[PDB]
Amino acid sequence: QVQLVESGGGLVQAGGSLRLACAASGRIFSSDTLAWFRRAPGKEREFVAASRWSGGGTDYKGRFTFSRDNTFNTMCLEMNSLKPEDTAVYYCALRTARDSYYYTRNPTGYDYWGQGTQ
Amino acid sequence: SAVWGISVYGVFVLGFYIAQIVFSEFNRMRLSDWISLRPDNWNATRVAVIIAGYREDPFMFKKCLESVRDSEYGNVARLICVIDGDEEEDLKMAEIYKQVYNDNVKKPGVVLCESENKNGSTIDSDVSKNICILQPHRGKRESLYTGFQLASMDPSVHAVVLIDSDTVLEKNAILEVVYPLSCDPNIKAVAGECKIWNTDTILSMLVSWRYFSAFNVERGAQSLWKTVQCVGGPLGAYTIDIINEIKDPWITQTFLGNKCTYGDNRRLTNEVLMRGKKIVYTPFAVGWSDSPTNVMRYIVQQTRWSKSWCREIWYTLGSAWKHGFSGIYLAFECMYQIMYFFLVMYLFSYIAIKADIRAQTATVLVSTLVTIIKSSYLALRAKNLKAFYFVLYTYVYFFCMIPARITAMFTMFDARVWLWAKQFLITYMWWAGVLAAGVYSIVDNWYFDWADIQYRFALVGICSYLVFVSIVLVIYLIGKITTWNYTPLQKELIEERYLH
Amino acid sequence: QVQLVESGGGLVQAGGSLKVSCAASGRAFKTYRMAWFRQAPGKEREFVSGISALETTYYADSVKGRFTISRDNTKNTVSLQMDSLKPEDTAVYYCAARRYGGTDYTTTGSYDYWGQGTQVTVSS
Ligand SMILES: O=C(O)[C@H]1O[C@H](OP(=O)(O)OP(=O)(O)OC[C@H]2O[C@@H](n3ccc(=O)[nH]c3=O)[C@H](O)[C@@H]2O)[C@H](O)[C@@H](O)[C@@H]1O
Ligand SMILES: CC(C)CCC[C@@H](C)[C@H]1CC[C@H]2[C@@H]3CC=C4C[C@@H](OC(=O)CCC(=O)O)CC[C@]4(C)[C@H]3CC[C@]12C
Ligand SMILES: CC(=O)N[C@@H]1[C@@H](O)[C@H](O)[C@@H](CO)O[C@H]1O
Ligand SMILES: [Mn+2]
Ligand SMILES: [Mn+2]
């Protein structure tokens, strides 16, 4: 019902500040939780950050920042003080409130996924 | 004698209305002061949403569910939907729910109220997943008891929000009904505003402003003393603690010798009132509902409401003493509402039996001025110029409310002909009596004396009143043609219906 | 149509008091407006007093306080009481009734119905 496309990322030196923009086509209902998942080579998907469409915020850090336009159905995640081990594939995931209103960090709960970047 | 009657009526209406306006302004100031101290990103009370429906149109049910899902409140334990179905037709409403929410539609065999174990764990097994329940048709009270039990299953739930199957909420209609519960420990119930969106017909247009006046003015003054008489159907928040205590003497309600199958929100508020608790009304919570368009259905609704009013008025008078000094105003409001109908009836009878043009013209002009002031206040408050249409509501009150109130007492104090004349014969008799009185007054006073100053005054006043109502109706017609009377929600809903 | 019958009147010395009254027979006396006119020996009819359907009293000049007009719907009659009689007051009094009219009320032609009238004479 909703299609998520994430853009941004690339080969960058340790000193830099990336910006990944995830745009969703469909309806978000101001209650779905949007999250970013990290997949390093040879590893599995791990939680990075998440936030409700209305408001909130839960990182991990104090260095990552979450932004939501809330008007064009798109949102952004920025990075600061990149590390050599931070390079991985980033996935934009959405969790609807149809099943339950509980918040979880398990990637299994999320049902909508997009193609990875970087 | 006529001068005394007119002056006393005018004062007895306008002074009380002004006092209600002042008290509502004070209540609004208090609510704004409470809100000003709310920290950003506040989520402390855990709320459970309860919706009860019965054969609702799929479009409006879907819109209500989506608007509920659009709420910005971040602390919602679970959504509970209860349907009076289990035949076949309401399976389609369950399908709409499955389209809007998860595929969890239980089919209990019996109602919890009649069950030997009134516990939610009998029919429910998960406390974290949204649940829809189809129950045998027993009414709205029986379905609300099941929702209360399911909400009381979770020990972390602190409050419940009740929504009708048609009410469409705003983005912050839940956050505003649950904050006053955490402001004062003695507050155990919060009332939300209700608005009418289908303001296309003239009757619906008048009913919308009647609702606005009866919510902003009538209930704000009551909430200043924290003694709201009725929380309301479309929107309302309750504490789980008071519900766990008052839900037992609420399903076995008896009045004289029979069960009650109407109200279900006024008695629930009254039960909170009789325990000394405080109930407030927040004007910042908005819920959109529809109003009947046909006159006969509106009359039926009004008489059904008055049926429960004529009992809960004595029920609240019997418990107003527990609150203390707060409650003298409650009793005064009750006596005002009791005596106002009698005063209107007596004044109409006195000015109709004595066919005097002067008294009739003076009464018409005084009523017009009073309703103009009342509509002006609503126009100032709502920032909307359409509130002036409320000046026409008097006609409705003289043709759709008074016969309904009379019928509500003449049938409760005690084939198709009895089923149809039990609710409309009194209305027809009232209309015939009004027409006969008008014809008698016109025929008895049949002369034209322009040399008399008072006859000129009477004729000019009646002509000016007719011109005023005519231009008001012309403005309404022009607005309807231009679609200026359509609310933005109605404008969006019409386009959505067309797109479907 | 209304029928007017006069009553009262007689010989009264100067400075006395006299009450006359006209009774109307008709379908509805309440809506009618009554008036009392005088015909002097000069034979020029003129307005003297009037009462409207809304109990409004109209008096001519020099008879503002001397003359008092009253109306009674129970016996559907209108009575004029005159005090401090003067030599010029000896004349014939007529009672007239109207149902439809305009701003003009002092003219004899503006009243549809009329009465027989009675002669009142004053002796000095
Ligand atoms: O007195 C009352 O309890 C109701 O009266 C009116 O109700 P109305 O809109 O005029 O007519 P309905 O549509 O029949 O009732 C409103 C809702 O009550 C529920 N209901 C009604 C009837 C019923 O048999 N069972 C039932 O659950 C439904 O959810 C319905 O949406 C008010 O609009 C309601 O806010 C109020 O709850
Ligand atoms: C065949 C035709 C000529 C019949 C004429 C109808 C009249 C008998 C009706 C039409 C409008 C009515 C009036 C409409 C409004 C009012 C105000 C009403 O007072 C209220 O509305 C008080 C309650 C409130 O404030 O809402 C008192 C009766 C009165 C004068 C009504 C008296 C009866 C009237 C003149
Ligand atoms: C808009 C609103 O709340 N209207 C209420 C209705 O919900 C309630 O059922 C009834 C009492 O029977 O009283 C009405 O005033
Ligand atoms: Mn409905
Ligand atoms: Mn409704």
Residue numbers in the entry:
A (entry chain C): 1 to 60, 64 to 121
B (entry chain A): 38 to 451, 467 to 552
C (entry chain B): 1 to 124
How is this structure described in the published paper?
HA consists of alternating N-acetylglucosamine (GlcNAc) and glucuronic acid (GlcA) units and is synthesized and translocated across the plasma membrane by HA synthase (HAS), a membrane-embedded processive glycosyltransferase (GT). HAS integrates several functions: (1) binding its substrates (uridine diphosphate (UDP)-activated GlcA and GlcNAc); (2) catalyzing glycosyl transfer; and (3) translocating the nascent polymer across the plasma membrane. HAS transfers the UDP-activated glycosyl unit (the donor sugar) to the nonreducing end of the nascent HA polymer (the acceptor sugar). This reaction generates UDP and elongated HA as reaction products.
In the resulting cryo-EM map, the GlcNAc primer is well resolved and occupies the same acceptor position as previously reported, stacking against W342. In the presence of the UDP-GlcA substrate, however, the primer rotates by approximately 60°, placing its acetamido group away from the active site. This rotation positions the primer’s C3 hydroxyl group closer to the putative base catalyst D302 (replaced with asparagine in this construct). In this position, the acetamido group’s carbonyl oxygen is in proximity to the backbone amide nitrogen of G270. The sugar’s ring oxygen is adjacent to the sulfhydryl group of the conserved C267, its C1 hydroxyl may form a water-mediated interaction with R256 and the C6 hydroxyl group is in proximity to S345. CvHAS binds both of its substrates in similar binding poses, with UDP being coordinated by two manganese ions, as previously described. The donor GlcA sugar sits roughly underneath W342 of the QxxRW motif. In this binding pose, however, the carboxylate occupies a pocket formed by the C-terminal end of the priming loop (residues 298 to 300), the following helix that begins with the invariant GDDR motif (residues 300–303) and the priming GlcNAc sugar. Furthermore, R341 of the QxxRW motif is in close proximity to the donor’s carboxylate. The distance between the acceptor’s C3 hydroxyl group and the donor’s C1 carbon atom is long (about 5.2 Å), indicating that additional conformational changes are necessary for glycosyl transfer.
